[PDB]
Design a protein around this ligand. Sequence first.
Ligand SMILES: NC(=O)C1=CN([C@@H]2O[C@H](COP(=O)(O)OP(=O)(O)OC[C@H]3O[C@@H](n4cnc5c(N)ncnc54)[C@H](OP(=O)(O)O)[C@@H]3O)[C@@H](O)[C@H]2O)C=CC1
Ligand SMILES: NC(=O)C1=CN([C@@H]2O[C@H](COP(=O)(O)OP(=O)(O)OC[C@H]3O[C@@H](n4cnc5c(N)ncnc54)[C@H](OP(=O)(O)O)[C@@H]3O)[C@@H](O)[C@H]2O)C=CC1
Ligand SMILES: COc1cc(Cc2cnc(N)nc2N)cc(OC)c1OC
Ligand SMILES: COc1cc(Cc2cnc(N)nc2N)cc(OC)c1OC
Ligand SMILES: O=c1ccn([C@H]2C[C@H](O)[C@@H](COP(=O)(O)O)O2)c(=O)[nH]1
Ligand SMILES: O=c1ccn([C@H]2C[C@H](O)[C@@H](COP(=O)(O)O)O2)c(=O)[nH]1
Lengths: 548, 548
Amino acid sequence: MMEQVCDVFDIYAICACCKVESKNEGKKNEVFNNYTFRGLGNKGVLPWKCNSLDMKYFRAVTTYVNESKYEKLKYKRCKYLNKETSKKLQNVVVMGRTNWESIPKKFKPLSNRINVILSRTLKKEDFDEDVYIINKVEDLIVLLGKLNYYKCFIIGGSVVYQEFLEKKLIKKIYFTRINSTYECDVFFPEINENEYQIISVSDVYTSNNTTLDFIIYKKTNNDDEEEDDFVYFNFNKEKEEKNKNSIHPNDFQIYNSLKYKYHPEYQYLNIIYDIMMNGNKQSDRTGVGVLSKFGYIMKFDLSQYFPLLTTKKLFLRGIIEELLWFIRGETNGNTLLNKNVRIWEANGTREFLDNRKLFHREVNDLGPIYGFQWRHFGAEYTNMYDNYENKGVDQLKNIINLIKNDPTSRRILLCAWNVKDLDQMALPPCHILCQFYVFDGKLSCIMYQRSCDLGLGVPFNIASYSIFTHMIAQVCNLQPAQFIHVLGNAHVYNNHIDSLKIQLNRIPYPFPTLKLNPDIKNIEDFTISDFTIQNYVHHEKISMDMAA
Amino acid sequence: MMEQVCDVFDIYAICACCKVESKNEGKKNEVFNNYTFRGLGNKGVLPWKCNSLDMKYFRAVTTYVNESKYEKLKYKRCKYLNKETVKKLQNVVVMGRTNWESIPKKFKPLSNRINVILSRTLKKEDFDEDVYIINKVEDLIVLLGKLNYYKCFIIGGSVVYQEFLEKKLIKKIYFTRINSTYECDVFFPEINENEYQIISVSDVYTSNNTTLDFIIYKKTNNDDEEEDDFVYFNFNKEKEEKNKNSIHPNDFQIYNSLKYKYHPEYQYLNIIYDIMMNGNKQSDRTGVGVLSKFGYIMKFDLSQYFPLLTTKKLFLRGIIEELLWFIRGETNGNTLLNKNVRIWEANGTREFLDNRKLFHREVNDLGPIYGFQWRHFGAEYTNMYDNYENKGVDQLKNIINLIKNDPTSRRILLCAWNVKDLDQMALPPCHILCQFYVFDGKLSCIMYQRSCDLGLGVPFNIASYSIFTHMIAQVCNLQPAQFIHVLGNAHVYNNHIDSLKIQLNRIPYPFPTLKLNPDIKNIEDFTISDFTIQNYVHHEKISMDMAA
Ligand SMILES: NC(=O)C1=CN([C@@H]2O[C@H](COP(=O)(O)OP(=O)(O)OC[C@H]3O[C@@H](n4cnc5c(N)ncnc54)[C@H](OP(=O)(O)O)[C@@H]3O)[C@@H](O)[C@H]2O)C=CC1
Ligand SMILES: NC(=O)C1=CN([C@@H]2O[C@H](COP(=O)(O)OP(=O)(O)OC[C@H]3O[C@@H](n4cnc5c(N)ncnc54)[C@H](OP(=O)(O)O)[C@@H]3O)[C@@H](O)[C@H]2O)C=CC1
Ligand SMILES: COc1cc(Cc2cnc(N)nc2N)cc(OC)c1OC
Ligand SMILES: COc1cc(Cc2cnc(N)nc2N)cc(OC)c1OC
Ligand SMILES: O=c1ccn([C@H]2C[C@H](O)[C@@H](COP(=O)(O)O)O2)c(=O)[nH]1
Ligand SMILES: O=c1ccn([C@H]2C[C@H](O)[C@@H](COP(=O)(O)O)O2)c(=O)[nH]1
């Protein structure tokens, strides 16, 4: 409706923001929000000196025009200033003198753009380079009114942002989240949850030893016969989504208001959306009640990020201890309970072993599960205390030796589904197999999962099998490529829906990175201390069962 | 500069065509083309009588209008026709008199459509109904230049379709391929490969005991600041696909010209494309050589069709014989060789077994492969001839019991990959496992394939596990729903590229159906003659190695 100057003159802002090096007062119990990324500068330069990929983005966003689109904009513009009217078409960039003087010399003036400097102290006079000056903010709307520009971009710094934001002159913010912590003296202003709303989250990337992503904030309110062919080919599609009334999508205003959902966490989130909306109502094993669907695939680029969900808090100590426990060959539930890892406690009780008909199994003797099948597949299992040295097939050695000696084998599979020993296990494995693939000094891993609890379980599963990939890759002197997660029976407990709905409306943060201690070169030689998650920025912990 | 009458007045053709009961004298092996589908009428009615879904398509297309797109169409019609001006908007349908009389009284005149009838024999006075009688094709274009209408549909019959193409007054043909054979007396005119081309192929469907799909012929030749965010987001891609120049897109002229590739065969065809364009070049030692990628999922709706590739010829006797062999628990190659099925011949050789270090293994004794594992997993393998009675886990009987008695179990897997036995097998299994899923008395099957020969092996693999799905579904008194194919290591052999390029440019035919003998109530009691593929319409056989 009507039109503010921001809409009319197509004036956007572009920035790139750090986390700040505060003296945290014995509180690794840290809360994170949109204001977490503000850091703009330090001693008159960027706090990270150079981020090569952001520098690529910033250029491509400021140096892009479509001539085609210009016609419409020249109308709506000229008709409003009430004055109705070869080089090339170009974008404007607006910068504070301080920012101008903090840009290196080689970049000045910014190629194929219309460089403008807001300054009161200096004037066209003082600048030995091809520019325009101005000494107030109203003076820019004027320079815009006259010139041949496709879009105008506010490229900082803080002072210039704060005032342009105050008088709501900016239509969108193209905002780079640099997901590391540096020293900062200057800061981006507290963006107003009311006035501006994220509408788009890019992919996550690694550049110069840090992950980063690109989001878009939007200002608040208040062939054609080939398109018909689409409608005809969609003629048999059911009228509305099956559990529409049942889940009520109008609740996910934010999830649905996003245009571009290119953050990899959306791979998980969209499966949760898909199941809630089109999932089959099933009720048994307990009468507990699930929405279920069959056969999904998620791919994470471990070279660019560690995919630890950011739409809730996750803890990995337990997940890692469990991984190290499989690797040692162990089936002894006590080892994990002494480290207060209680993943397997429920499946070791006398009651649970008795329902599972294992009347002759010691409590917490989980039987021939992951660890035993990894290092001794085929061996007759006895009890958790037996050393099975040299008995059965050590698949874990075998697949590590296949990667090193025969990277191009298509038989690098690690299988926990021993059909002979299923009934002897406390619980047959949810995680059926990993298969590996080596290209050009790079390791990908497929994990097939028969049964996927999506609100409690798969989030941990992603992390486990991502960590395991790294461990394998390092041990075989390879770079990790993709973790590919194949979901079989994929289900949401009805108990989880209220919490997953809260979750779906949270905008993921840039993912963290995993640092393995590089000295560890045998799969058996990892210690809990060898693992570090770095720069994990996350929303509040969610109880998935909202019970009390 | 000419503007076409068919573009200006938006004149379209819609039809439904079956195969003709033509005298196929010594043609049991017969050649198939787009004219295989040409049957329109028999004795003044449709050769198939009712097809519910053809009817639902026809109604949707011939009624559907869009008001926004009228303002432009009126402007264009007025311009061409000299004019300028400016209740509920409709399409015109144009039938011949025989067609009109062929249509049941309960459908006439056609709802929410302007009905035009061509006739000399009959004048306006011989009708009671709300229709326009015209007596020549020129009187239509007169009437179209007077009326408000969205689009004009020629709905037959044969004489009407004929003259409208004689005069190139048809912009596109919406053609329903009814994949069944019927007595016909009236035929659609042979479409001229030069004047018209297929730009779109829909999903395949089952209705009234036939498969059918929808194809579109086209006449041949002679906030958008939110479309800007899309370009910003794709700022970091390559200038090419890895081996783009290596293969050349301009070779897939037909494949790339199609707009909507909604036929399920494209799931297979599109993976071939993705591997050819983005595949990694690898060597299986000694320089055998492949393009590989990792982790793809295809899904086929067995309730709607049987997915036997139609873009080359496939025989299924061998494949069914192999599967019966598996089910009996056999490991004996000779049983197949005596049935003239050579699938396992190469793998059963003295040279081949000796190369797998199986020096104590009789010729054509393939050892503990699928058959042995499905019925005896865990038993120590002796030889081909040992009846391994009540030994190992019979996981086939176990999964058939889970399905009929615990249908919501997430533990209904059938595993071939017995790690103990791998080195004793002629070949580790390519097909790792099947998982099943029951909902609302319908059965779906995932199978995970570690190594996938896209040109030669996969087409047969899709058939094998699609038939197995039907077999299990029947024996457990369920409907077949989905066969879901999870590709691990997906590779095209360099030998296969020339042939696949040919296959990629062939347009699929509607898939055939599969009928099982309904009497068989145990998985053990199936025989070759209990299996019949109805209506396999396919392109010429292709040899993938064009070698000599
Ligand atoms: N990562 C990022 O996105 C960005 C990083 N930066 C960081 O920003 C820092 C500098 O920013 P900051 O110190 O806030 O300064 P600014 O770049 O915002 O410039 C401030 C100066 O601009 C002039 N000015 C501001 N408002 C007006 C006005 N309304 N009319 C006229 N002149 C005006 C004045 O200069 P004068 O007194 O001469 O008139 C003022 O002192 C650098 O260290 C750099 O690292 C900079 C841009 C973006
Ligand atoms: N499967 C499908 O998509 C379709 C099926 N059909 C089937 O096709 C059959 C009918 O086909 P067909 O026999 O070719 O009949 P048509 O529907 O083509 O009717 C032909 C008759 O229409 C009139 N007519 C046609 N063109 C003209 C013209 N230019 N000027 C004046 N009158 C004209 C004449 O009727 P008159 O004798 O009164 O002068 C002519 O004999 C039926 O069996 C029907 O079931 C029909 C439509 C489509
Ligand atoms: C092109 O070089 C620079 C650009 C910027 C501004 C800037 C940089 N990145 C992003 N995303 N937005 C911005 N507004 C700031 C700079 O340092 C102060 C630069 O020099 C290193
Ligand atoms: C809606 O009823 C009928 C429609 C048609 C024409 C027709 C039907 N289907 C398609 N795909 N194209 C057509 N032109 C033909 C008919 O029978 C001769 C009908 O009566 C059942
Ligand atoms: O890592 C794990 C372990 C367990 N589960 C869940 C999936 C199912 O909800 C349940 C397995 O029970 P069955 O599928 O065997 O019935 O545990 C997971 O999602 N991830
Ligand atoms: O039903 C079958 C049998 C074999 N293969 C192919 C896949 C590989 O090209 C090859 C097996 O090679 P390895 O995976 O054993 O390395 O056989 C199939 O695609 N389908």
